[PDB]
Each structure stands twice: as C-alpha cells, then as structure tokens.
C-alpha cells in the first residue's frame, strides 16, 4: 500500500529527472530540457493526488538534502506530522552508478552534483504548496529561503530558464494571501517583493535569457497598474528589452494586454487598438486561455467606444461568451443613439459587475462619448444642419452649449466640420477625391513593407530544423 | 404525411393575437375538427399552451389500433416469404401512422428499420425526404438542415432525376427559412418550371415565396424578366389573397407609381409577411430594404430633389419622411444628405476613383491577417 | 436614366438637366479584385495541407 505507492510515484520522477540531468551536462542543449519542463509541471500536478503525497519525502531522503529535508519537514508539520517510517534513511536507491549520483564520492565532497538538483527540488515544493493551497506561514517561509539560494548561485543559461519559473509562483502566492485578508504585514512584505525582481532583472539581461526576461517584465507591469503608478510604467516600457525571439505566444499576449491599458488612460486610443487586436492573435484560443480571451474582448470593446467608434454589433451576439458582454451591448446602444438618460441608467445597473475589473472607472469617462458620437452621426446624415435641429433630435440643452461641444471636437478633428455662426448652420467639409491627393501612396507604401517583413520571417526560421537533420545520420 | 403542415399553418393564426379576432376564430373552426380527426395531441400539446382526453383515448386507441394493425401485419409478412421487401413496406406503414399523429420521434425509428433492409434505391430517397418534411412541420430550422444533408448524400448516388425536382423545393424552404435570401430566390423560381409532387405541400406556396424573394434580391432589369414576365405567375393570375397583395406591390414599383406604393407596403405586411411562419421572422428585414430601394432608384435619377417633392410623391409628410431617411442614411446604400437649411435633398452617390479604391483595400486586409496567423505558429513549432 | 442610354441628373430643386456620357472606370482595379479573391481561398488550403506538423 503505502510503501509500494511512495516508491512507484518516485520512480517516474527520477526518469523525468535523468533526462533533464543528462541533457544539461552534455553540452548546452538549453532549448530541449525547457520543452521537457513545460510538460513536467503538468504531468506532476496530475501525479500528486494519486500514489500518496509523501512520495516527495522519499525522494528528498533518497538523494542529497542540503536544506530541503528541513523544508519538506515544515510542509509535513503544517498539515499535521505524518508517520509511517517517514524518518530519514527511509529511502536510498543511489547504488554507485554515476548516473544516479556516485554514493561514496558525493558524500565525501570530492565531487558536487547537488547544484541543479536543489533548484529542481525547490520547483517541486512550490508547485506542491500551491497545489495543496498551503498559504500563511509557508508562503513567507518559502520566499525567505529561495531568494538567497539563487543569489548564491551563478546560474548558467540553462539554470536561468529554471528559476524563471519559481519567480512566477513567488508573485502569485503573495497576491492570493493578500486578497484573502488585508493586513499591514502583507503591506511591509510587498515592498520586499518589488525590490527582489528589480535586482534580479539586471543579472538576467546579461545572460540574455529570452525565457527569464519575458517572465519578469509581465509581472512587473502588472504590479504597477495595481498600485496605479503611471510614471514608473512608462519608463519601464521605454527600454523594450522584452524579447520576441523565441518566447511563447502566451507570454506575448499578456505583454500586449497591459500596453493596451496603459496607452488607453494616457489618451492614445489609436495605439491601444492595435495592441488589443495583437494580444488576441498571439493568445491560443484554448479553455486554459479562456480567462485571457474573456478579459481581452471586454477591453477591446471599451477602446472602440473611447475612440468614438461603435465596434461590430455582431461581436457581442455571435460570441458564446455573450452573457458577460450583456453590459457591453447596453453601453453600445446608448452611445450610438446619443440617449443621455439611457447611458447613465446602464452603468448604475451593471455597476457592481463593472467595478470588479475597474472598467467602472473607464465608464465614467465614456459619458463624454455618448454625446460626441451622436453628433458625428447627425453631421454625416445632414451636411448643413442648423444648430436648432441638432438640439431638438438629441434633446441637447441649448444652441450655445452644443456649439461649444462641436467646436471642441473639430480642434481634435474628429467631426471634420466647421461652424458658420453668421449663417446659422454647421457645414461638413468632406468632398472625397482623396485618391487624387498623395495620401493613398503613404498608405500603400506601408503595406509593401509589411509583406516584406513576412518573407524575412519565413526565410530565417525555415532553415533552423534542416541543420539538425543534415548533421543527424539518416538511413 | 400531407395534413401535418395544413394543421400547423391554421394553428399559427390561432396562436397569434396579432391577427384580427374575426380571422382568428375562422382559423379556430377549421383546425378543431382536424385535431380530433388526424389525432394530433403530441404536437397539439405544445400549441395549446402556446396559443379532450377523448383525443387521447382516441390517440391511444388509434395508437394501439393503428399501432397493433401494423405490428401483426409485419408479424404476418415476416412469415410470408419475401424477407427484404415485404417487411420493409410494412415498417414504412408504421411510420406513415407516426407521421400522421405528428410524432416525429417514432417516425424515425420505424423508417430506420426500413432503410436497413436493402430495397428499391428510389424508395430510400423518398424516405430520407419524408424525415426532412418533419423538420418543416415543427418549423425547427436546425432539424431541416441536418436531415437534408443525408438526402443529398443519397440523391447523387441514386442519380434520381425525379426526386431531384423535390430537392429544389425543400432546399428552397431552408434558405427561405433562414435570412439569407440570395440562395432562396434562385431555387424557388426554378421549381415553378419543374414540379414533381409525391406527397407534397401545395404549388400555391411556391408562387408566394418566389415573389417575395424575387423582390428582395434581384435588381431592376432582372426583376422584369424573372418575376413580372414569369409566365406561371401570370397564368395562375391573382386568385388567392396572399398572392394578390404582393402582386400589386410588384407592379407599382416597376410602373413607378409612387402614390399607391406606400399603401401597398402596409397591405403586404398585414396579409403576406405576418400569416407566413417562415417569413414572419423576416417581415422586418424585407420592408427595410424595399423602402431603401424606391429611394435608391429615385436619387439615381435626381441630383436634387425638394423635401416636399420627394415626400408628396409617395404620399407621406415631410416630417415623417425626414425621420425615415436619417435611419437609412448611415447604412450607405442611399449616399445622400438632407440640407435642412436649403430644403433640398442633394445626392453624393460616389462612384469615383476613390470609391473603387476602398473596395479592394478591404479585401487585402483580410488576406493580411491570415498570413501572420499561419506563419507565426508554424515558425514556433 | 435607369435603362441607361444618357445617364444624367434631373434637378427638382431648380430645373436643369445635366448630361454625362462618361463610361466606365478602371478595368485595373476590377481584375485586381479577382486575383485577391483567388488568393484568399488558396492560403486557407495551404494551411490545411500544412497541418501534418500539428
């Protein structure tokens, strides 16, 4: 029962380990262990429940333990001290093979093999802690211990890839406990958390690890918005060291989401549009990605209303995520028709939903767009239209008030109109024949460059597998 | 098979309260006898809410009579030697009864057995179609769709020309049933040319549908040839009321009567679009187009109009017309503005160079996004 | 005008008839729509082909 289960689960762990162990120590095959590690987290999360969970303790004992016996003890203590011959020496399956850590030599300290093993062991504890949902004591105990250990290491390109993943867990775990309960102690430790990412990012730029650079930047941009600091976020993005060389599309998609938010509040809805479209493209469409797609659609719709444009009606409809976007359709109806009352009623009703994501705050500003949008439409239908007509239609308070709103608009040039005070009408200036002017050329010049950039992307990537095969023997 | 549609169409008028109370109760007289006669309780249960237990004793009796009759008939004709064919015909006969009481569930079962057995190749095609007919009875669009594929699977293997004529009309009703009319107008007018009816909804229906769909899709010149100068539609004259209303609307548009045009729109809506179950859905959708069309032609012919000339021709007031016009203008099928101040309706109608430039660049953006999509994935892999 | 043998414009708001005998715009753009039309289907096909990697 217990003995069988502990050991069998442990067997699989060592097979996975051997593969990653062998590959890092024979040249730098850097990319290949990384693909294994992705698959590893998934396989491990599913494992843990089946075949007991003190399978990890056996593993600790079995190999060399420099601090990890104490860590594993601490976890065991937390959920009640468990006993079944779980005293050290319980497991020992090294047996003098150099691939399973030569038993005499390692212990004497005539050879060291602990380095990379320790980083991996830690990876299993953070994963398992998070799995189980052991918070409070352990969360602080864990951060306290892992950060000085990496900073005592001088981490290879390979070892850089491993610790990019502990970093993820360090950030999330501090957040969940904070969200669970507010306390000043949570607040003191928050300052500690920012400072550690900033010190490490410089180290990781010098090793130029595409994995490591990517993970850290996504976390930091997120932290900053949560504390609302505009200023720090703009400086942090200026550098743009955020790679696109090899990193996953999931990593990028996060990166693009944050930029959209950031640019939107700074009043650039032009560039926010491009980012938010770009964030959807990179993201895979998966169920495991559903949370991201759901937040992405919502942000897209807010940007289109901030610009002054109505997004496609069909977006909200044809979605199978249509239920969440119930608040979005009511906002879209109110904006397009210029109904002053409707708009205010909508945001009262869906307020608490909207407050969750702090889209409430954007919607206070979307009050302005109700009016802006409606005037653009009235002007496109009716070229010369007395100021008197406009007010009657959309119940605007007076001729003096609407004149001024229109006046403001055409400074920023959205309406593309002009007021003729003396004659009492507002006259749209549009006339077409912009094909004759130089503007299509500017447009088309860019479109050529985009195709060329496609070709290059094709060419470079294409040759990288072929190298492998020519070098490999073939039948 | 035949009555199942007859019932429901009557029942629809009873259901609606949009219909006049006089008409409602005409329908009530007619349907009530046939509920009892064809024993229609499973379907009738839905509608009764939705607008005797004897019907049921009758159901159950009928169920059992018809149910038992057919049962032991097959027990008889398993024995009597002809194992592929006579069991098949007897199994069909159970399904005939199921189809009679408007329970589609039980129909599918018995006709399933019929198919298993290997019989005349024509016969099978007839059965598949019968199942697709049941989709029109419930008027579930989703039921008709799935089934019509099985029919189309066997049609061309069968290479039946004869039941190939039926295919057209049924597929007319799917495309009619749906909003998309571009496929519907073509299909339904071809079936006026060739009609083959073996247990099929009247020829009258086909006339009504061609006329509507003709109007929505076709341009001016092709409307004349295919609808106005249809020999069948003219030869059948306007007999039935539904057919009559649409015919007056068609002539006026083409003869460029403007005064009676708007009253015929009101007429058509009262008497054509709303009685039909399939184009009840599309009543709103049809009208919006047709009001744009009278205008779209008129603006072609006139650089400027007054509001009073435009309004008055149709027989609507200036205030009403102006409002209707601002609804249609942002869809950009009219390409005109209304000068309030000068009181003129000026016509922009751009077919300039800059116009043709827009149409090709929107196609190019569609191709641009796809290239990125295939490439980026495949490069990572 | 609808038939189309003189295609011009009538002014209700005044009383002039303007005649335009201007036949038709660019073949160039038109045949360009056809080439783009083919290409949209073609890329999806290729992508179908390219799915042995997946």
């Amino acid at each position: 029962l217990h003995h069988s289960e502990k050991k069998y689960a442990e067997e699989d762990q060592v097979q996975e380990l051997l593969k990653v162990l062998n590959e890092i120590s024979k040249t730098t095959l850097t990319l290949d262990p990384r693909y294994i590690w992705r698959s590893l987290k998934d396989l491990s999360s599913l494992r843990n429940q089946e075949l007991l969970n003190a399978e990890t303790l056996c593993f600790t004992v079995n190999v060399l333990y420099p601090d990890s016996s104490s860590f594993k003890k601490n976890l065991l203590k937390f959920i009640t001290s468990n006993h079944k011959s779980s005293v050290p020496g319980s497991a020992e399956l090294r047996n003098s093979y150099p691939a399973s850590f030569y038993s005499v030599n390692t212990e004497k300290k005539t050879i060291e093999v602990t380095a990379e093993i320790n980083c991996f062991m830690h990876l299993l504890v953070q994963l398992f802690l998070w799995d189980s949902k052991e918070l409070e004591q352990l969360v602080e105990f864990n951060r306290k211990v892992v950060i000085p250990n990496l900073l005592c290491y001088y981490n290879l390109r390979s070892l850089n890839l491993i610790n990019a993943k502990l970093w993820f867990y360090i950030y999330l775990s501090h957040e969940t406990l904070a969200r669970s309960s507010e306390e000043i102690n949570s607040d003191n430790q928050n300052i500690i958390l920012r400072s550690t990412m900033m010190k490490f990012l410089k180290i990781a730029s010098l090793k130029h690890d595409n994995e490591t650079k990517a993970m850290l930047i996504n976390l930091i941009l997120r932290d900053f918005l949560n504390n609302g600091e505009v200023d720090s976020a703009s400086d942090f993005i200026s550098k743009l060291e955020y790679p696109h060389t090899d990193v996953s599309s999931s990593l990028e998609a996060r990166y693009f989401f944050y930029l959209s938010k950031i640019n939107a509040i700074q009043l650039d809805y032009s560039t926010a549009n491009e980012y938010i479209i770009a964030a959807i493209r990179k993201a895979p469409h998966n169920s495991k990605s559903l949370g991201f797609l759901q937040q992405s659609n919502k942000l897209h719709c807010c940007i289109q209303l901030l610009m002054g444009d109505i997004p496609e009606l069909s977006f909200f409809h044809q979605s199978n995520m249509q239920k969440s976007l119930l608040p979005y359709y009511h906002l879209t109806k109110a904006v397009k028709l210029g109904d002053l009352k409707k708009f205010t009623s909508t945001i009262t009703k869906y307020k608490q939903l909207l407050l969750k994501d702090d889209t409430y705050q954007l919607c206070v500003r979307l009050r302005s767009n109700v009016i802006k949008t409606g005037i653009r439409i009235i002007s496109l239908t009716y070229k010369k239209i007395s100021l008197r007509d406009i007010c009657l239609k959309l119940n605007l308070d007076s001729e003096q008030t609407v004149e001024y709103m229109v006046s403001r608009a055409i400074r920023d040039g959205v309406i593309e109109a002009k007021i003729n005070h003396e004659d009492g009408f507002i006259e749209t200036t549009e006339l077409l024949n912009i094909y004759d002017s130089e503007d299509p050329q500017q447009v088309f010049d860019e479109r050529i460059k985009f195709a060329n950039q496609l070709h290059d992307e094709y060419l470079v990537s294409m040759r990288y597998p072929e190298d492998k095969k020519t070098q490999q023997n073939e039948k | 098979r035949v009555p199942n549609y007859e019932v429901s169409e009557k029942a629809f008028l009873l259901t609606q309260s949009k219909v006049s109370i006089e008409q409602r109760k005409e329908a009530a007289e007619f349907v009530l006898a046939k509920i009892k006669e064809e024993e229609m309780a499973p379907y009738y249960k839905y509608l009764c809410e939705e607008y005797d237990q004897e019907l049921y004793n009758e159901l159950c009796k009928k169920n059992e009579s018809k149910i038992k009759e057919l049962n032991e008939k097959i027990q008889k004709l398993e024995e009597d030697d002809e194992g592929e064919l006579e069991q098949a015909q007897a199994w069909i006969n159970l399904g005939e009864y199921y189809a009679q009481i408007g329970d589609k569930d039980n129909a599918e079962k018995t006709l399933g057995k019929s198919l298993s057995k290997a019989i005349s190749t024509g016969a099978k095609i007839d059965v598949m179609l019968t199942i697709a007919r049941l989709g029109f009875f419930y008027n579930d669009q989703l039921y008709v769709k799935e089934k019509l594929e099985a029919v189309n699977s066997m049609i061309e293997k069968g290479g039946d020309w004869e039941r190939r004529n039926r295919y057209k009309t049924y597929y007319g009703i799917h495309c009619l049933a749906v909003r998309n009319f571009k496929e519907a107008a073509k299909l339904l007018v071809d079936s006026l040319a060739t009609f083959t009816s073996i247990e099929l909804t009247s020829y009258e229906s086909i006339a009504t549908y061609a006329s509507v769909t003709g109007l929505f899709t076709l341009e001016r010149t092709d409307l004349k040839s295919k609808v106005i100068d249809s020999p069948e539609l003219l030869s059948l004259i306007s007999t039935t009321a539904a057919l009559q209303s649409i015919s007056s609307l068609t002539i006026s548009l083409y003869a460029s009567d403007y005064a009676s045009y708007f009253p015929y729109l009101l007429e058509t809506y009262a008497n054509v679009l709303i009685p039909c179950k399939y184009l009840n859905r599309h009543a709103d959708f049809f009208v919006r187009e047709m009001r744009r069309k009278v205008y779209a032609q008129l603006l072609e012919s006139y650089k400027t109009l007054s509001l009073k000339s435009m309004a008055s021709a149709f027989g609507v007031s200036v205030a009403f017309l102006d409002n209707d016009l601002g609804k249609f203008i942002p869809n950009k099928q009219l390409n005109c503005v209304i000068d309030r101040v000068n009181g003129i309706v000026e016509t922009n109608r751009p077919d300039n160079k800059n116009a043709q430039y827009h149409l090709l660049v929107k196609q190019g953006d569609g191709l641009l996004t796809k290239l990125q999509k295939y490439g980026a994935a495949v490069r990572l892999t | 005008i609808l038939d189309k043998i003189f295609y011009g414009v009538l002014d209700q708001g005044n009383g002039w008839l303007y005649v335009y005998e201007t036949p038709n715009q660019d073949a160039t753009y038109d045949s360009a729509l056809e080439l783009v039309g083919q290409l949209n289907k073609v890329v999806d096909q290729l992508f179908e082909k390219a799915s042995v990697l997946y």
Binding site: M462, E474 | R379 | -
Partner: peptide, 27 residues
C-alpha cells in the same frame, strides 16, 4: 516553401531516430 520544407524535416526526424534504435538491436 516555408511549410514544404518543414514537412520534409518532419519525416526525416523519424528516419534518423529509427537508425539509432536499429543499430542497437542488431549489435
């Protein structure tokens, strides 16, 4: 051209793997 070359690489991976296993079995 991007896809076709990839297709070829994919088959060849299998060709080379199979060499290694078969050399082991034979020996």
């Amino acid at each position: 051209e991007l896809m076709v070359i990839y297709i070829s690489n994919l088959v060849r991976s299998i060709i080379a793997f199979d060499d290694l296993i078969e050399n082991k079995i034979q020996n």
